[PDB]
Amino acid sequence: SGAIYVGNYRVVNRHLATHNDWANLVWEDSSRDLLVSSTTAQGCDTIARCDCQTGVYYCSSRRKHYPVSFSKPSLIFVEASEYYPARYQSHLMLAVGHSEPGDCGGILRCQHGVVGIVSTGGNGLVGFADVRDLLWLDEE
Numbered sequence: 804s805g806a807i808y809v810g811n812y813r814v815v816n817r818h819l820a821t822h823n824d825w826a827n828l829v830w831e832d833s834s835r836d837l838l839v840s841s842t843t844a845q846g847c848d849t850i851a852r853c854d855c856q857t858g859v860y861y862c863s864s865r866r867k868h869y870p871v872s873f874s875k876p877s878l879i880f881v882e883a884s885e886y887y888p889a890r891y892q893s894h895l896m897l898a899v900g901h902s903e904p905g906d907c908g909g910i911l912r913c914q915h916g917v918v919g920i921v922s923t924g925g926n927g928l929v930g931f932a933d934v935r936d937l938l939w940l941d942e943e
């Protein structure tokens with residue numbers, strides 16, 4: 804589990820969105836595994852606006868933050884799970900690192916701010932849903 808809290812937005816994995824998220828919906832995209840809902844309180848996270856390929860992510864199944872090198876956001880085939888059939892996920896970045904299903908939502912960050920959240924995993928790989936292109940998270 805986990806979310807990004809930027810401005811009056813809450814960014815979560817679409818597959819982990821709650822009823823309150825769907826009832827306060829701003830934007831959702833199943834191909835990216837992302838959903839954004841509105842919040843009453845202002846958050847403290849800031850979004851990175853860069854092309855870094857190195858950063859640090861939080862792994863809840865280890866209670867640890869790990870430094871990683873990650874690929875650029877791309878269209879990647881992801882195996883079937885309880886939440887989606889086997890399909891292509893867009894804006895996904897891969898790295899070598901530990902991930903279990905419940906690690907989804909952990910933040911990946913670079914020197915500029917939050918880069919994305921854990922969205923995929925298995926066999927020593929971890930995948931992150933990028934948010935750096937969502938410029939509207941910084942306003943309104």
Ligand SMILES: N#CCc1cccc(NC(=O)N2CCC[C@H](C(N)=O)C2)c1
Binds near residue numbers: 881884892903904922
């Ligand atoms: N190998 C292995 C098992 C394993 C370990 C660790 C994680 C996973 N699960 C996943 O990657 N996802 C399940 C939630 C939905 C995700 C999505 N964005 O489509 C895909 C699977």
Ligand SMILES: [Zn+2]
Binds near residue numbers: 852914915916
């Ligand atoms: Zn950066």
